[PDB]
Amino acid sequence: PFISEAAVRGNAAVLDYCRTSVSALSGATAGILGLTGLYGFIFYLLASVLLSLLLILKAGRRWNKYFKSRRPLFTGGLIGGLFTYVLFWTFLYGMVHVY
Amino acid sequence: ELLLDSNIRLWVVLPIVIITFFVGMIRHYVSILLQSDKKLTQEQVSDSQVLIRSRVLRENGKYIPKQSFLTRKYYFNNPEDGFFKKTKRKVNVTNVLPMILIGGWINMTFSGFVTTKVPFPLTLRFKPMLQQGIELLTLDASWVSSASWYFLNVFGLRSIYSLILGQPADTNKAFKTEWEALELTDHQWALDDVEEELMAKDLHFEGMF
Amino acid sequence: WTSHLNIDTLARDEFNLQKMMVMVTASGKLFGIESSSGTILWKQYLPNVKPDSSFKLMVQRTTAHFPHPPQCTLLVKDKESGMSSLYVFNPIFGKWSQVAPPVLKRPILQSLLLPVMDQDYAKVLLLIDDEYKVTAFPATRNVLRQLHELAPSIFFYLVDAEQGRLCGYRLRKDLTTELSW
Amino acid sequence: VTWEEMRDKMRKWREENSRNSEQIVEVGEELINEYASKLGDDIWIIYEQVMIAALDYGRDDLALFCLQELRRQFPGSHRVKRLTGMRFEAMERYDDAIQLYDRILQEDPTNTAARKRKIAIRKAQGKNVEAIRELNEYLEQFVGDQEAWHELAELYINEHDYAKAAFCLEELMMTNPHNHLYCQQYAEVKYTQGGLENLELSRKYFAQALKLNNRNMRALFGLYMSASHIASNPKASAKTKKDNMKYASWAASQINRAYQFAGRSKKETKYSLKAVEDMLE
Amino acid sequence: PSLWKGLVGIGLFALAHAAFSAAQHRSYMRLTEKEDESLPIDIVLQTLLAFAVTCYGIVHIAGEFKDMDATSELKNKTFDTLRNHPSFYVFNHRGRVLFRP
Amino acid sequence: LIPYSPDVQIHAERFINYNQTVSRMRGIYTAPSGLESTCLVVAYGLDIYQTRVYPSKQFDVLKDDYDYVLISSVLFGLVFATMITKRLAQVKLLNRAWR
Cα-Cα-Cα-Cα torsion C84, C88, C91, C93, nearest 10 degrees, comes to: -120
Which partners does chain E have (≥3 C-beta pairs < 8 Å)? Answer: A, C, D
**Inter-chain touch B156–A21, beta carbons under 8 Å:** no
The single-letter code of the amino acid at A80 is G
Q: Å from C32 to nearest chain E CA? A: 24
Report helix, strand or coil for D60. helix
**Residues from chain C contacting residue B6 (CB–CB below 8 Å):** 14
CB neighbourhood size of F84 (10 A): 12
Contact B119 A40 (CB under 8 A): yes
Give the whole-angstrom CA distance, residue E67 versus residue A6: 10
Residue type, E69: D
Contact D203, D230 (CB under 8 A): yes
Distances (CA, A) of D51 to A87, D62, D115: 52, 7, 20
One-letter amino acid at D158 equals N
Residue of D nearest to E71 (CA): D178
The three-point CA angle D122-D127-D132 to 5° equals 75
d(CA E85, CA D270): 38
How far is the C-alpha of D55 from the C-alpha of D21, rounded, in Å? 8
Which amino acid, one-letter code, is at C82? G
Write out chain F residues lying below 8 Å of C35, CB-based.
40, 42, 50
What is the C-alpha to C-alpha distance for residues F39 and F27, in angstroms, rounded to an integer? 16
Report CA Rg, chain E. Answer: 30
Amino acid identity for residue E100 in this structure? R
Q: Look at residue E73 and give its three-state secondary structure.
A: coil
Q: Closest Cα partner for A21 from A59, A56, A46, A47?
A: A47
- Is the Cβ pair B46, D141 closer than 8 Å? yes
In chain D, what residues touch E79 (CB-CB under 8 Å)? Answer: 181, 184-185
Cis peptide bond upstream of C138, omega within 30: yes
Backbone angles phi, psi at B108, to 5 degrees: -70, -45
User: DSSP states of C100-139 as a string?
Assistant: PPP---S---EEEEEEEE-TT--EEEEEE-SS-BEEEES-
* Half-sphere exposure for B184 (CA within 13 Å, toward CB): 5
Cα–Cα distance for residue pair C42/C92, rounded to 1 Å: 8
Q: Name the A residues in 7-36 with CB < 8 Å from any E CB.
A: 7-8, 10-11, 14, 17-18, 21-22, 25-26, 28-29, 31-34
* d(C-alpha D180, C-alpha D206), whole Å: 9
- PDB resolution in Å: 3.4
In the beta sheet, which residues pair with residue C128? C110, C134
B114 CB-near residues (< 8 Å, 6+ apart)? B2, B4, B8, B131, B134, B139, B143, B144, B145, F59, F60
Distance of alpha carbon B172 from alpha carbon B47, whole angstroms: 10
Q: Compute the C-alpha angle E23/E29/E35, nearest 5°.
A: 135
DSSP secondary structure letter of residue C97: P
Interacting residues of F69 by C-beta distance below 8 A, sequence separation 6+: none
Whether the CB of B4 is below 8 Å from some CB of chain F: the reply is yes
For residue A63, report the phi and psi dihedrals to the nearest 5 degrees: -85, -10
Give the nearest chain D residue to E82 (CA atoms): D17
Cβ atoms within 10 Å of D75's Cβ, excluding its own: 8
CA distance F82 to F98: 24
Test the F interface: residue of B31, B109, B165 with most F CBs within 10 Å: B109
Q: C40-45 and C29-34 as β-strands: parallel, antiparallel, unpaired?
A: antiparallel
Nearest to B30 among F63, F85, F93 (CB): F85
d(CA A3, CA A5): 6
Plot region of C21 (φ>0 → left; ψ -120 to 50 → alpha; else → beta): beta
Q: DSSP label at E39? A: -
For every residue of F12-38, DSSP letters joined together read GGG-SSSS---TT--EEEEE--SSSS-
- For every residue of D85-130, DSSP letters joined together read HHHHHHTT-HHHHHHHHHHHHTT-TT--HHHHHHHHHHHHHT-HHH
Question: CA of F60, closest CA in chain D: separation in Å?
Answer: 51
C-alpha closest to that of C181 among C164, C166, C168: C168
Cα–Cα distances in angstroms (integers) from residue F74 to residues B23, B152, F69, in the given order: 11, 21, 8
How many CB atoms neighbour CB D235 within 10 A? 9
Give the DSSP per-residue string, chain F. -PPP-S-----GGG-SSSS---TT--EEEEE--SSSS-EEEEEESSSEEEEEE-TT--TTS--SS--HHHHHHHHHHHHHHHHHHHHHHHHHHHHHH--
- Tell me the chain B residues in contact with residue D144 when contact means C-beta distances shorter than 8 Å: 49, 52-53
Query: How were these coordinates obtained?
Result: cryo-EM
Cβ contact C15–F61 (<8 Å):
yes
Backbone angles phi and psi of B176, in degrees to 5: -70, -35
From chain E, pick out residues whose CB is under 8 angstroms from the CB of D18.
80-81, 84
Write a three-state SS string for chain B. CCCCCHHHHHHHHHHHHHHHHHHHHHHHHHHHHCCCCCCCCHHHHHHHHHHHHHHHHHHHCCCCCHHHHHHHHHHHCCCCCCHHHHCCCCCCHHHHHHHHHHHHHHHHHCCCCCCEECCCCCCHHHHHHHCCCCCCCCCCCCEECHHHHHHHHHHHCCCCHHHHCCCCCCHHHHHHHHHHHHCCCCCCCCCCCHHHHHHCCCCCCCCCC
Contact predicate B52/D175, CB 8 Å: no
Measure in Å the smallest separation between the Cα of C13 and chain E Cα atoms: 12
Distance CA D243, CA D231 (A): 8
Distance from CA of A90 to the nearest CA of B (A): 5
Are B146 and B111 contacting, i.e. CB atoms less than 8 angstroms apart?
yes
CB contact D79 to F (< 8 Å): yes
Kindly state the helix (H) or strand (E) to which residue C53 belongs, with its residue range.
none
Min distance E28 CA to chain C CA atoms (Å)? 11
- Distance set, CA B42 to CA B47, D109, D111, D140, D206 (Å): 9, 7, 10, 12, 39
Pairing status of strand C84-89 against strand C110-117: unpaired
Q: Using alpha carbons only, what angle is made at residue A67 by residues A63 and A70, rounded to the nearest 5 degrees?
A: 80
F35 closest CB neighbour out of C15, C19, C23: C15
Query: Which of residues 28 through 47 in chain A touch B, CB cutoff 8 A?
Result: 30-31, 34-37, 40-41
C-alpha distances in Å from residue D85, one per residue of B13, C117, D71, D107: 60, 98, 13, 16
Q: Which of A 1-40 lie inside 8 A of D, CB atoms?
A: 1-2, 4
- E84: enclosing H helix or E strand: none
Q: CA nearest A2: which of B188, D214, D180? A: D180
In 3D space, the residue among F76, B206, A25 whose CA is nearest the CA of residue D257 turns out to be B206
Dihedral (Cα; F89, F93, F95, F99), 10-degree rounding: 150
DSSP letter string, A35-95: --THHHHHHHHHHHHHHHHHHHHHH-SS-TTT-S-SSHHHHTTHHHHHHHHHHHHHHHHHH
Q: Where does residue B139 rank: exposed (0-12), middle (13-18), buried (19+ CB within 10 A)? A: middle
Amino acid identity, position C136: A
Alpha helices in E1-101 (DSSP H): 4-32, 41-61, 95-98
Q: Is any Cβ of chain B less than 8 angstroms from the Cβ of D250?
A: yes
Q: Any idea what the Cα angle at residue D222 is, between residues B205 and D197, rounded to 5°?
A: 140
How far away is chain B from the Cα of D134, in angstroms, using its nearest Cα? 17
| Residues B20 and B150: beta-carbon distance below 8 Å | yes
Distance from CA of A11 to the nearest CA of E (A): 5
Q: E and D: touch, per 3+ CB pairs < 8 A?
A: yes
Decide: residue B189, CB within 10 A, 0-12 exposed, 13-18 middle, 19+ buried: middle
CA distance A17 to E63: 9
DSSP state of C176: B
Indicate the helix (H) or strand (E) that contains C21.
Answer: strand C20-24
